[PDB]
């Protein structure tokens, strides 16, 4: 039976939460650790551990995610942005794009918090990972950690094509773009995938299921939603929970779990402040307006909401090249062959994310001089004296990411961009004490004028990259900015021959132009016959934009910018009275304790007072390792006890052990 | 291939089936009511008095329903469609054409003059709104193809609304991995129509989609 | 990030280059080693490591090769021969036929260079390989090297059929035709394939990727073309490179890499002299004519171009026998089954090259007396006192090698011949300082009259072999010499019954003779009923040729002879002033140093002053091991440091370890 009282209680079993619970259970096996999670258990679930099927988690009827609505925003041209987040054990790590990315060294220094500097955190960064690839800088990577990272067991050929194109734009190839220092470069992009097994690497399997399979002091409580935290004599003593599915309205149930030594809140950036607010932590006026009795005056709870702002731009590829489009469209024979190969030996398209190459970039001084004055000033204030921070990221996806029922048949590649350190800020707050109730949510996407120019810049840049790739065969008009019809910057579709190739030999309407829905790509320049064949090229024209074109791109950004699921900041570390970066007031001290109460820490991405220049799973893991260490120290543990090594059979490299995959 | 095979096989058998039609099964000739006229450009209101008012047998617009998409299928999503086909009956616009050389093969200097007279715009706008209302009141109707409709302001209540989640999944098939994946906000979904009147005889029950209101920005689009 | 300065720089990551870079990185791991390659990275690329798909690399639109054009030649009846070479990391070893062949002991002795005698090189020969098959002479083979050689995991039945036929011609079976001494014999032909994995063995995976996966001092720089070598104070100090694809003509880019200790040039026989010539090494008159300022007077650069001259002769096989033709043609179901077996356990047709048996031959004194007087004299001068040198090679391929869209449907086997030590010589030279520019190229194929007789001889010999094989079912007239129509030596196609078998039961034109495009094979002799069944035979007639027939074969050779991709000699080792075998002047000393400069070695096939009696991957590897040792000694290393052992997990044999494939 599940005990009613634990020593340590971890709320939310996501990317950070599962890591924290697993580490703490190995701190001392006489400690009873309870992990509470609203979503389903993910143990040996193929819909979690098979990499290649990851897009289905973002279907609106998905069971593995929640879809939070927000208020209409004039900055998004009236849109009420939908902000998804994980609803399953493992959290984001069970359903993410599997992109491996580290921030810059200055990111964590700029937290302005004791013990959270990169110099302090670097051994914890290495602690998490086993780096399953060639390494020229092993001093800043780990090779024994429970989370395995690799290039997967399949690489779509867009990889080196993208790198050649990006090099010609002044974006240099590097062996490691995740070296905590480089802010302008291109690389072969790593994945949260164990190449030995061909499986996704998630926090639950790495830290929780491994532990539970070899020890007895860790308890797993899924399908259980955390309502509020109960305070007794200034100490966080208990948690009230309700079922995640209210299936008996005639007599609703609830449970109370107690903690003797420690409670850690890890429900994620969106949900953690809601828990705190329901517990009486926040702005007294707003709390009372939501029917909650105030307990601790902390106006910072739910404030300082940050994210990365992303958008997708799809391109036509030539019929001979590969993509995952037919697979994710639902072609039976192709799905059968892809699964068969994985069952055979764990290789093939199922063992990758198809996100094979990407870029971190900063503007040149000339490029800056062409942008909004507002961002030029923002650059001086935030970026100019921080040479290691990237402004934009984008990467190439070997297929269309999005709804295939709303795009024409054929094969695609998608440019995936996001803004690294937005100036915009949002907020979130409960509407009632009902734990099921939808919160009042303003993500704040693009509400600061400084955030527009980099996004416009990135679209133009990635489009230029795309047009210089061998894969390129055209631009999907419906999913590009709505340029003036006869603009020389307009989207140009695949030509007649390519259309007929995709239409097949029996088609009766390929190249039927009547209606003027699209305009065709023109033939590229001829190969130089005086050159060696392997150096010959066929080039498409560079694109020039006027003010009308730029206007179209801006509206494009406003209408198709989304969350990149990297939400952070709603429980910021900082001085309670506030700071320049935490204007509404800090929520946590430098040891992640919630102000105004004892025995309560927050350990997830809500912690970050300012942003990080990376996809945020590395940040979540780092926060997890750090939070576990903080708890351990607080409970009087030291030295090797703080290792908190989880059960793991290490395979190393093939040439050393003969056990890892060749 | 299989559908083409069956269609040809039926025609070879006895000359019947889909091969023996154009799929253009019904249509319309229309004139504006005096109220509709009062909402149109002043230029066409004057054109109507000059050309149509004393000629009661002349239609202003035609449109018909095509049982499929007419156009390039490689530039529209998979699935099944129906198309409203409109044209203007007596345009005021005029064009011209002339040879460029005595070469019989030479391309002529050609100005068809499409829409160069300002009076020709209002009836076309009118016809789009009319046929759209027809479409939304048909049992066949399941949504509007946003890429092939006017570029309304994104949050306009007149914007094109695509097929919903369930219909997308039906077209995507049971193995699909991205039907209803909204991220990117490329389309917006049709809402559920009104409920059937349970107090009515089943064959008279209906499910209705909303009428559309347009402002000046919509009309511009 | 990729450093701008290395200790050692290796230019070209081909068969030799990857070996050299890998060895040197293990010489001392404090040494920074940079490997620059124009082609793509080949790491875990199935289009490289799957043996059975190798023919696609020679499609004219292949990404993995460059196709160099040459000047029209009267000796090839006006043809401008196309000379392909590799354009990918691993070089030739990533795309070759996978035939394992060693030269004769006298070949390396005849280099006339100190330290390059077979006695000196023999331990380096063994060092490279792990010999995964039965060995009666283990003293001259290796069993611990990183390059695994084997008979693959599938053998087409043409193997023993060929050996029985060749034996009846006076060509004796041997257990090892690669024993450095035998010049007249037949054998089961070895492959550059690891039988444990069923994968191709290439230099990049063996020496480079293995090293980079376990050490940090080796850097990989692909998609990067070497322009020229920069000399500072008589020392090779830097390399200028450009992208392999010029994708930004408005502002072309370039990079400079520096070397502290050593530069090794390994761009291959075709490309290495081009690099030297662009660097100012060559004939001053020709250099100035090409717009390059002379630096070092070395007229030998680009001279002494040698190769093996090959041709293919396809034969019809009986419908019941196997070939890879349907697989290569693109039959979906057969391709599916072949891949499925390989995924299952690494066996089947995908794990072989289909080149199962072959021959090294010398003419008998009678055969010699029937040949051109010019070659009879050439034989006395070159071969008579060198009893270990073969004159011709040919082998049997279990399918048609060539364009299947230009040959009738059905199944085939192909005789693959090449001339071992041609007397002909060619040359190559840049046309401008543009690194992309096509060179002025005269391969010199068949320009010496002495080279014709052996080729004619070999065609007649292999044809006789073919007609004595059980597989034999006819001769493909369109791909054979254009004999006089009614000659008794003419090509005879498959008969009526066999045509109907291949045509299938629904055919309406098999055996429709009208047009007289072909003539049918007659029935062979009857079986001897008085003999034991397993000794019964059915024999086709021997062929007699007159002068008109011989004329047809000569024109056949002139019109269908090609490079065998074994090009060598353009940077010959020898005295700078010249020699009898290096008439235009030596380019390198016996330590492979380029004359007139310090700190620059050439390490690839361009090194060889005279030819070798073998497919040249063993030579490339040997040159690689030798060059690495030379560099190591020069830098002051000795003893076990010169081992330069690369990371490897050894599996040995099954009965010893239980780890290797049974
Ligand atoms: C679709 C998608 C793709 C992504 N792609 C990438 C990528 O490629 N690379 C990358 O690095 N990052 C990616 N991210 C982001 C990911 O790294 C997240 O930032 C990370 O999971 C955040 O970790 P946490 O802060 O622990 O929140 P998480 O969302 O991971 O964890 C919170 C957990 O608490 C549970 N929970 C919430 N409220 C609760 C309540 N009231 N009671 C009980 N339980 C509750 C949730 O179910 C969840 O499991 C992606 C995210 C998503 C959603
Ligand atoms: C299709 C094919 C089949 C073959 N079959 C066989 C066989 O069965 N058995 C056998 O033993 N041999 C075979 N050979 C020959 C093979 O062994 C070659 O002789 C061997 O690879 C030569 O080795 P290298 O001299 O290192 O040159 P390689 O061509 O191997 O290496 C040269 C490298 O330099 C790179 N390069 C060239 N110019 C450059 C520049 N300007 N800048 C940067 N990089 C540059 C190239 O990309 C290449 O990787 C075959 C060759 C080919 C092409
Ligand atoms: Ca500042
Ligand atoms: Ca009138
Ligand atoms: Ca001699």
Residue numbers in the entry:
A (entry chain E), C (entry chain G): 2 to 663
B (entry chain A): 333 to 553
Paper quotes:
The methanol assimilation pathway is initiated by the oxidation of that alcohol to formaldehyde. This reaction is catalyzed by the FAD-dependent alcohol oxidase (AOX; EC 1.1.3.13), which belongs to the family of glucose-methanol-choline (GMC) oxidoreductases. Like other members of the glucose-methanol-choline (GMC) oxidoreductase superfamily, AOX1 exhibits the characteristic two-domains topology of the PHBH fold, containing a FAD-binding domain (residues 1–155, 192–306 and 568–663) and a substrate-binding domain (residues 156–191 and 307–567). The mature active form of AOX1 is an oligomer comprising eight identical subunits, each carrying one non-covalently bound flavin adenine dinucleotide (FAD) molecule as prosthetic group.
The final model of AOX1 was refined at a resolution of 2.35 Å to R and Rfree factors of 0.1774 and 0.2049, respectively. Analysis of the crystal packing revealed that P. pastoris AOX1 crystallized as a homo-octamer with approximate dimensions of 121.8 Å x 133.8 Å x 134.5 Å, which is consistent with previous studies on the AOX oligomerization based on ultracentrifugation and electron microscopy. The octamer appears to be a tetramer of dimers, but can also be described as two tetramers positioned face to face to each other. The two tetramers interact exclusively via the substrate binding domains, while the FAD binding domains occupy the outer surface of the oligomer. Comparison with the structure of CO, the most closely related structural homolog, indicates that formation of the observed oligomerization state of AOX1 is mainly facilitated by insertions involved in numerous interactions between monomers (residues 326–351, 486–548, 247–251, 638–663). Interestingly upon enzyme oligomerization the PTS (residues 660–663) gets buried inside the octamer. Interestingly, the omit mFo-DFc difference electron density map contoured at 3.5 sigma level clearly indicates presence of a modified FAD, in which the configuration of the C2’ carbon of the sugar chain attached to the isoalloxazine ring is changed from R to S, hence being an arabityl rather than a ribityl chain. Importantly, the change in chiral configuration at atom C2’ in AOX’s FAD results in the formation of a new intramolecular hydrogen bond between the arabityl C2’ OH group of the modified a-FAD and the N1 atom of the isoalloxazine ring system, which most likely modulates the redox potential of the FAD cofactor. Analysis of the crystal structure of AOX1 reveals that the active site is completely solvent inaccessible. Importantly, the substrate-binding pocket of AOX1 is reduced in size with regard to CO, due to the replacement of CO Ser101 to AOX1 Phe98, CO Tyr465 to AOX1 Trp 566, and CO Thr 376 to AOX1 Phe417, and in addition is more hydrophobic what could explain the preference for methanol as substrate.
